[model samples]
Target: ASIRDQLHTIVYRYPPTYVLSSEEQDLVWKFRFYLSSHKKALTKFLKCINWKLEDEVTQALWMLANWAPMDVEDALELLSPTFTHPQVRKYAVSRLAQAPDEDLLLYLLQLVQALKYEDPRHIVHLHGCINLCTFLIQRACTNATLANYFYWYLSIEVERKQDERAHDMYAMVLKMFLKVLENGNFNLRGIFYNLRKQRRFIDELVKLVKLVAKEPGNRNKKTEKFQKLLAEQDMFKVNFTNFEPIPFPLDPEIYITKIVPMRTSLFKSALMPAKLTFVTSIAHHEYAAIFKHGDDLRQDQLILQMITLMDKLLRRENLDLKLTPYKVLATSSKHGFLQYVDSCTVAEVLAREGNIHNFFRKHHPCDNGPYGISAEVMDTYIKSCAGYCVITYLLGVGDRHLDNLLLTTNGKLFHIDFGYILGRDPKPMPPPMKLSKEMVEAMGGISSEHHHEFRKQCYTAYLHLRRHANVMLNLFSLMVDATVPDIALEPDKAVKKVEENLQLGLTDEEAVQHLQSLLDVSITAVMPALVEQIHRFTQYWRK
Candidate 1:
């Protein structure tokens, strides 16, 4: 209550700027003391603007931001469109460096809107907006407004496409957001999940995905409908300078173009971000059949759906892991695609180095290594490997190979290609779940201290998920009748495979020993990697 009054009296009386009160003197440090127990009031005080107290408000806002961060909705007054006082806007942005779900969803949409139109007054406020966007972007998603802007504006922005100068800055900002999120050490791809069926948020998002999947033969006609649909969408495109991230396989002929986000400077810590996802071409018939069944268009999309279900369950159960089980939708029998995080290949990472150890050292984040790798990055990789290892083994996923296993620049490792899950290995008897020699080596080999750290992470992660074995099994069980190819192939056996693997009701030691057994098989199973080598050789020869 008196927080504001005390600040005002302190500010104008001293007039630090030397010109009455609007001095920009940075009274934030001084003001923080008085607002000790009063945060809600500050938000109200800031939202209700009065130019008469402009200088005081500015100082108060900086104090508010510096002292404690504001929620996305609460910070509105400082954002453009909502930008009341330039100084306050600048202050509000500074608070976004750190910033949630229904509640998370609201903030995410606001953050997206903020990025699109939260224009700043000057370079100072611009930075605030950038920082705000970065914080939000790290845990962000899209909707009507974004769909409209990207469909209409993205397709036309030559300057905003991959590697273009304008894109460079946007990419920088976007990548920094990713780097920051990665640093937080949890699978955040689900950060944007659960918008599904909430007042039809997912309904809209699903339709949006399907539109992109529309077959080319009918694309122009289908696109026109989408175009009109977007035209009627609730949009906020004014002064929306930036475009959405470009898709991978940036070839124009490709109906969908997706690209992975990488390479930005903060000096140049950030700019804008390119596409964080890659939704490339659809699955081949053979690949589609194994997972999708005789090939319903939704076949592929459903697999991703199952993945999302599992990912969400794991996250809710307090499992510390992340996956980019991005939205998947089918435009028709032939046009839909799956969207997942675009990441670097472990193969590519290895291709750059002398050996696994050298690779880690060269890319270690703190070392300022050439690859922008960090200790934090390595940690994310290890933890992710642990989580994925348990889940994949339980799922009995096959076709484990380097190509589909991807690593984000931030050092997160995740698996893709669901076509071969549920004990279906295109490669004959491909070991239960692949934990490659390189992966073990990356964590400092079997006996190294780093390997010890890796094992702890793996066992701990497995133990945590094992607690949710029933819940996971139930989710998979429910899906058994859904006709997705993965399960439909052997419906009765599907849940059984997952259930048998549970080895549930085990004591702590038993569970740990089981985990160790899997690890041993993965590490000592020299034949699998050798098999992969032979397969790749034959593939190359065939090609």
Candidate 2:
């Protein structure tokens, strides 16, 4: 009480520039501590604060609530009413979206109607509206309001101009809504079907069906009845009970057309080698069986392992490669097996309009000594190569023969086969071997100068591999400490299995010694002459 009184007095009497002395600030913090220690008292204290200071009080309360561990419902209740205040409401509503269960749906429904189009100014709150729609669509199984909201929003947005951003937003909403209908559990499916049963919602959806059909990209003839209904706007009078539902594979042709072009990209060329290798290495029947069994977890594990290995190799100091994973889409085939594609891998990048290798040659035309290869261009090539090495190694990928290592018109290298990935070692029957003729040729034909630079790159890459190994270990350690549940296996068993595997491949001691030996060999025996040869070559080119 005294602290509140003092704060009120200070606020009323002091000028804006009046700073709280450190001692006074400490006192204020102490009062805060006391209030936080008792929830009931803190709530009462919050009530006592002046209504005119609502914004400031709400801000402080929000910060306090963030720090405290409170129930999700309680937090939503406290924050929901404040949605009328734009500053407080936007963030509050966004936080609520994270909990997309029944309670959250109910709360949002109540909150939306409470706002009630009473004030014309409320229409400007599109951010809140969008967030609500996004949350509802993402967590669609909750109720009819969400289903209605999604369909209504799509109906309204699809009719807008092509240039409007809302058009894209509506497309995503419709996609998600359809996914809910097709993939959601029984309860959610029931709610959505119920919404379809309602005349108003069905009428609105039918209208959207026609609008979408008339659009340039709407090629799906499967929804023709819906389109006709929308054109007539009297389909609600027809008995939907007798309507034969199209099966899950409805509009596959249209769906494929819509998705294929969007996914075609430069990454696809690079991934070709890995994909081909993987496909050929595994027997078609066995692979088909694995997919037929719907073993997504097993496949994802393989993919993750491949990613981890590639990450290590590409990020090596010598390689310094970086790539981002944009999307991975997998679909089950008629045979009941899954086939997956990475969208980023297939995505195209604009390249120079000439032979890729020739373009590189033009930039660095001289046959420089070993180290004299275009340092800038070589670095870029090395980074890209490293990414391939990591990916290939993790997947145990093979058959990266001459034609498979591709250069984009922009001088970027990509690996495009995976037939031998995921433990399908191609050279398992062979004993330890020296560098192949192809490898030597690829590194500029194995002259003394070439050997020197090659060794240096290998050593540098080794050092980088060690560094990444540590990073992986640390990540695993953190995961263990956090006690993340293993959904596929018993938690203890999962942790144990992960730890056991982590130790088997490369111990810290072996990694350090291997890296050291590589560095010593490259620097002491190879680099000096390599550098000199490159210098001589560069000079010759100039002459």
Candidate 3:
């Protein structure tokens, strides 16, 4: 009783990282009423409970029902690996279910990883993980986008040979995926397995692109000639549609009617991203995509998944940054296909129009805003610049130059080429993120209100993601053993690299300050600018 007052004061002042003594933990649990008075104490008290003791765990679980409702962010702590109790996790899942589909999809990446924490040997563990899986699978069955991601997420686990139990659990869930698809009048199994056949077709198609490259005349003419040649040879008949109407994997929202082989064309890039168009049935639109080869697109696939998830999280937080996270699927380590957004590279726009402003004015001209741009266009430019800036920095996406950064006509800026991420940069000492002079100029320069807005948005977004840092790390943890190139190089340190980039040790205010420092460092970063100039010079010399 005498030590109770001292323990109370300690609970109030102890830092989040501090571990409590066994005596102190007992005292805190004994006076649950006092601890419950402070909502923030839930996290600290949670850690104090010895999960191994059923007596302590049961009491903790019972108190959980009586404790004041916690925020979704706090509930995330209850779902962490440290919380071994199935009921505790199920409680978190119940609370998590309160989140709308948009919010759930954002955290789905991490929730999938939470399965790794389950006690695989116990029936209760199986029941708990299955409950979570059912929740996710039910959601996936309804939403095409959710199903697309859920399918890939589980499919990766199914392919993993390291864990026998994980393999069985994922396989069972994947079978559920198939059942759900069948029950919902949907299916991708045939198409998924037939991708190997598509790869074979892709090989033949690559030959045509190579053969066309050898010819000198108009590139479009050469492409058309090869298209005719393929028709005469009756090629590209691999079952992309599985002989039945199904949503395309490149875009699950669209149902493929058939492949429009005549429109297929090879791009001019060294390892060309083959542009293939498809006619859709119910969607009533032609879908165009780029099939890429000679690169390990698994890295691109992983990076795009992260980008898409982050974009969703930002939007759920009511911070729309106009981020474009186009869909990319790596069918094999060597081959993949990506959605072809109608956008020009920053390099192409600069070469053609002389400046970013000119490019915007030419495409989306208006007199109602700065730089002869519409307000919406200007807003998109500022927000997307901030979005990519903060996201790329947090992800440690490197090898930034003009060529890979794409700009849509409406002013949405997004990055491509995931060859360098997790701080792996080909160029020496790359900037924290690609905040180019052209991007700043488009945002009305450093002195402009737009630039300030960009910085503000970046800080807001960075701080927001930091709130879900554990969830982010959990997702990365699942990918450490994947065949992704950069991640494969240092499998043991992959998650740590992301952890360091997140700067999880910082407080919210400190996080904002750190983000600001990154912006300041990147804005006038000399080496990246010089690198871009040299890159331009090299392209010109090559031409």
**Number of the top candidate by lDDT?**
3
Give one digit per residue, the lDDT tens place, for model 3 in 1-543: 667677676564434334555566766777765557665557666777754465777677668777876556556666666666777777777777788776776666566666565655543444444456666766776566676667766666665465577677767767666665654542444444433333355565566556665767776776776566555534445443223455666665676655565778877676656787877775557889887766757688778888887887888898899888888876545566898889999989999999998988987777766778777888998899888888898889998888889899989998978878899998888778677778877786777898898899888889888766655665676565455788888987897887787786687789888878877777766436645766788899684
What are the TM-scores, per candidate, against the unseen true structure? 0.44, 0.32, 0.75
Q: Candidate 2: list runs displaced more than 4 Å.
A: 1-319, 322-328, 334-373, 398-404, 409-412, 430-436, 445-509, 514-543
TM-score of 2: 0.32
Ranking by lDDT: 3, 1, 2
Candidate with top TM-score is 3
Kindly list the per-residue Cα lDDT of model 2 for residues 288-394, writing each as its tens digit: 11112111222333344335443545554334554332112112111111232321121122133233334455556447722334655555554554444434432
Number of backbone clashes in candidate 3: 0
Cα RMSD of predicted structure 3: 7.5
Model 1: worst 10 consecutive residues (lDDT sum): 284-293
What C-alpha lDDT values do all the predictions have? 0.48, 0.38, 0.71
Better model by lDDT: candidate 2 vs candidate 3? 3
lDDT tens digits by residue: candidate 1, 354-416: 554455555464656323456666666677877777777877777777866877765667876
